[PDB]
Amino acid sequence: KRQWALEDFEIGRPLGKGKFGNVYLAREKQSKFILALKVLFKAQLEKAGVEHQLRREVEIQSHLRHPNILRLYGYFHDATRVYLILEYAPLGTVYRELQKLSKFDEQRTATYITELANALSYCHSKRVIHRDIKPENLLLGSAGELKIADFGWSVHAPSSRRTTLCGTLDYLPPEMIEGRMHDEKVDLWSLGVLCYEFLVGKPPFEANTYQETYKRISRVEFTFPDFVTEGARDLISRLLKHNPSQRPMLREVLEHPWITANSSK
């Protein structure tokens, strides 16, 4: 069959500054279909030692088919580059929305949480643990629907539990901090951290030094602002359990009365 070639795309502007300077608005030439096209340089990958991570990320995310998970339609490479052909989400990152808004009302947060739980639920039915749930790894499409975007730390854990410390400081589950093995319940932890950052504007274990944040995550030392409503506290508290075994199932999140009372049709 016909394989992708760069020549199949018209390339427009970078989608983003900084760490995203890398991903372009793109167009498939015949269909005129708008895409994001992520460009990676082989030599810099191979010098960094991260090329096997890439393999895993592509293999995983290109096989996942869900409304709230950004399609990776395909990839290809040439002498110098690897290209990832990704779904374009025109409304940008949840993180930008949080920056713009400061914190989200209850309806929006519950809707984001519903959408997201649905995506991870489906992910977990596949034995995939995401392992990097956080506002930047989340994108918004046309209708403002949530899509999971970054599968750079995700793993297919079909049988064996995992040892790899990965994720983002403020979102690390306690089992990772303490160097114990971990399973899919990490995503439940980070979900609770996220639901908190959504409503408050900052994550619950924020500290000056990472040393001090590690410690607060392990002791589960955090507090809620007065404005956080009882149902939101309950949910967050349920998700933020030191013992991963104590964390709810995603179907439970989806059926939580704060979530149901607050998410949309």
Binding site: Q3, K32, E51, E59, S62, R127
Partner: protein
């Protein structure tokens, strides 16, 4: 390297919700004996 992945690199006709089989790839990879 092997930039040869167990992943789609075939041209897609974008100009036309169910390609259901595709994610079967997970349980099959788990089902590898």
């Amino acid at each position: 390297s092997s930039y040869s992945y167990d992943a789609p690199s075939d041209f897609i006709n974008f100009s036309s919700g169910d390609t259901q089989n595709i994610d079967s790839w997970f349980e099959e990879k788990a089902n590898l004996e």
